[PDB]
Amino acid sequence: PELLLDSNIRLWVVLPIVIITFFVGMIRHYVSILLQSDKKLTQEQVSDSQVLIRSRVLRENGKYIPKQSFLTRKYYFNNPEDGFFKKTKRNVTNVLPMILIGGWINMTFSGFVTTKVPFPLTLRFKPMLQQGIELLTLDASWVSSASWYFLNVFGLRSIYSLILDTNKAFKTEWEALELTDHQWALDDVEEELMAKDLHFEGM
Amino acid sequence: PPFISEAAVRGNAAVLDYCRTSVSALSGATAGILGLTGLYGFIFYLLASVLLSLLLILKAGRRWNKYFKSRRPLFTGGLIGGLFTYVLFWTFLYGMVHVY
Amino acid sequence: WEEMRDKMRKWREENSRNSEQIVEVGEELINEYASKLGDDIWIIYEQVMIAALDYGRDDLALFCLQELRRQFPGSHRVKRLTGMRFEAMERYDDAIQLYDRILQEDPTNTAARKRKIAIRKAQGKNVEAIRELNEYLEQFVGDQEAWHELAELYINEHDYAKAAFCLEELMMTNPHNHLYCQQYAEVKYTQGGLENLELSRKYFAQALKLNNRNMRALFGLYMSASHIASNPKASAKTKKDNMKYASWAASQINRAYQFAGRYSLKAVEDMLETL
Amino acid sequence: SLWKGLVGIGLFALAHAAFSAAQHRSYMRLTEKEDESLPIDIVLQTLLAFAVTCYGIVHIAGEFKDMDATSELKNKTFDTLRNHPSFYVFNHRGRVL
Amino acid sequence: RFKWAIELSYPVGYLDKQVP
């Protein structure tokens, strides 16, 4: 902390770029909201997805119901040529407005020093952290503005959160549903229930 | 337990992150105030993070497993995203108090 | 004071149609507080309109609907609300033209179909409503409300066998609520047949393990077992295990009514002992 | 909502510490000592501010919830479940009134 | 003797065939 720097630097070059990046990271969110579209694609695809999800949940938790019923639907889905799967046949935006602005800055706020980082850095990285200076004697903790900008960028990622084919798919479902066990899995609940007591104390 | 709401889960995760990504910044500003450089600063982060975990355990009375199945998120949690923020507040306060 | 807002929200969330309190609190909150509330009143209008239709007034309906019109000119939901207004005053074909129009300009829009069906059912006809609803379900699966309405309709037509298929489709997913298993057990017990009562006791149980304070499931288990203990078609072991099922359930009911008592105990004990 | 005031008090005190320490630093660079450490008082002040602030922010951060679904089904009955709002019909007794 | 004994008496994916 051996140097004495103009306070006008603090005022007019530091706070501007702890602000700008914050408001730009907000605007990016709001504009992304305003940008995204949404198709009205088709009745066919939506229906097909819905039934595929019915199949998924069948394979997942089809083990709380009578066995014959599970097997009945499994047959309605797998039965040769009746089974449903055997009859139906058919970054950049992030990075770039952040890399274009660092350039503007380093073209604008160039010929001076900004601040100090309290952990010692490596020397080879000097010529790109200062970028205006012609001392080639300072330690590299004394940086230019661009580094402050990028540091702010990476540091304010986590503080916006706090303030805010068809046929093959069908056949794969069919194949993954062929191998399936009912496993009814309800066949001791009676005893388990009447094992210790009934539990209710909120009346 | 067998049947999970899967919404309360994300709520709990969020109310963790809202503590963690704040306390990180706070400790950073603190370190930049009572200026200490290099290694010791990093130590402070770990120490603060540890203290944070303990408070959570004291807010989740009796380890109660109805909220979480395992205490790992309390210790590990979101710990890298806390780092850059600690760094930034450290640097801000150092550059704002000792240099100027 | 804002509690009124949250109560209205509650009634919106867990559908609680009573349309007596609602209209009161609405007309209270439809006033200057509107500008205080901020960009949230519109739902409150869509909610007060229907309860008002339910109360008989029909005068507040057009005020709410015309506010909605002036804010959202080219909407579809307010069109549905106009269809509702029509069918309350018994213009059916007009409403059908309306719904077929806003399905004609938007095929993948459900509410129009689900109002056409309410119309078809309000006439008195059921049998065509059911096939219409199935032709809908033939496309828009994952429509749980529809499955439950279909189950209710099959019940009231005295076909208790396919309602159970719907309840299977409906408690396979979301298998964490007692009510569905309980209603399945009631279906089966009503359907008769030992092969079904064996399931009725099972599901009246599983629907109890989950909540462990329900009462209908308890009497259901007691009655299913007590009736198993007289049907002379099962091996002794069946009857001897159902006897203990029923007796333990009786003990638990005794506990419950004991908690309650702080004259009923007399009648319930009679019911207990008489078998 | 006293915990909010608690947090604002922690913040204010911390800022006071930062101001005191900046001016002390100026004293240092002015008397060209650059040998001594910070007075204890500032340190204690900032540290207690930190601890208090964390203890309050944990409270105001929110509230945990169970991850067992049926917890929120304990209080519920058919009357809510049965309504099916998208299948309503009004040709009933109420229209009398 | 149960005095009050009462006896009251196409959907996609529904068949009655006792399929194994």
Residue numbers in the entry:
A (entry chain C): 4 to 93, 114 to 187, 213 to 251
B (entry chain F): 11 to 110
C (entry chain B): 12 to 273, 280 to 292
D (entry chain E): 4 to 100
E (entry chain D): 14 to 22, 43 to 53
The publication says:
The ER membrane protein complex (EMC) has emerged as a conserved player in the process of membrane protein biogenesis. The EMC is an eight (yeast) or nine (mammalian) component, 248–284 kDa complex with considerable mass in the ER lumen, membrane, and cytosol. The EMC is comprised of cytoplasmic, transmembrane, and lumenal domains arranged similarly for yeast and human, despite significant evolutionary separation. The EMC presents two distinct and structurally conserved cavities on opposite sides of the transmembrane core that differ in size, shape, subunit compositions and apparent function.
We obtained reconstructions of yEMC bound to an antigen binding fragment (Fab) and hEMC reconstituted both in detergent micelles and lipid nanodiscs, with the latter strategy yielding the most isotropic and highest resolution data. Comparing detergent and nanodisc maps for both species identified two major gate conformations. The other conformation, referred to as the open-gate conformation, would provide space for client accommodation. By contrast, the one map with an open gated cavity displayed a lumenal rotation and concomitant shifts in position of the hEMC1 brace helix. As noted, we resolved several lipids in our cryo-EM maps lining the cavity wall and modeled four POPC (1-palmitoyl-2-oleoyl-sn-glycero-3 phosphatidylcholine) molecules in the hEMC nanodisc map. Density for the hEMC7 beta-sandwich at the hinge between the two hEMC1 beta propellers was relatively weak in the consensus hEMC nanodisc map. Mass spectrometric analysis of purified hEMC, however, revealed that the abundance of hEMC7 was similar to that of the other hEMC components. Both reconstructions, with and without density for the hEMC7 lumenal domain, displayed well-resolved density for hEMC10.
